[PDB]
């Protein structure tokens, strides 16, 4: 169990994280998140994305029983955190630091549709960042150095934490705003 955070050097908090913890600087929170607001560490779903894993339109909720509101998608729906292309640090917090296979990060294609559900077609499915977990338990906070692709305006980053000893993964979408 865990979530994408910005407690130390993380560039941007996960969408679910902002349902419970206010954003750095602005103090913004995501609203109307439903039950997952009390358990942001619990966006757990089937592993194997994108070959299997959560179906289109259920990526942000990971098909979770508690997180269906995260699948809502409009250009105005979610708090957007500023980002720039190039090297950035992504950060996870683990309330339970399970044995880990890897972490993978995907970004929306340039002309993705912000008013349609998130789908495989919305994302560049070649991850822009992969961090090996080596099938061991990580520390309860990790920092990943990733090279963020060039984009303009609102984009969504999908951070996938694949747990090594279950058939599940944790899925945290991140709403980001590039210049323009
Ligand atoms: Cu867990
Ligand atoms: K609510
Ligand atoms: K609720
Ligand atoms: K699977
Ligand atoms: K479900
Ligand atoms: K797994």
Residue numbers in the entry: 24 to 203
What does the publication say?
The crystal structures of the LPMO-calcium and LPMO-potassium complexes were refined to 1.8 Å and 1.5 Å, respectively, with R/R free values of 0.179/0.228 and 0.164/0.192. In both structures, a cation-binding site was identified close to the copper-binding active site of the LPMO. The cation-binding site is formed mainly by the loop located between strands 7 and 8 of the core β-sandwich characteristic of LPMOs. This includes the backbone carbonyl groups of Val186, Thr189, and Ala191 as well as the side chain carboxylate of Asp185. In addition, coordination by the side chain carboxylate of Asp70, located in the L2 region, is key to binding. The coordination geometry for K+ is that of a tetragonal bipyramid, that is, octahedral, whereas Ca2+ coordination is characterized by a distorted pentagonal bipyramid, with the two carboxyl oxygens of Asp70 involved in the interaction. In contrast, monovalent cations appear to confer only small stabilizing or destabilizing effects on GbpA, with equivalent trends observed for Na+ and K+. The role of K+ remains enigmatic. In terms of protein stability, the presence of a potassium ion in the metal-binding site might be equivalent to that of the lysine residue from loop L2, which occupies the metal-binding site in some AA10 LPMOs.
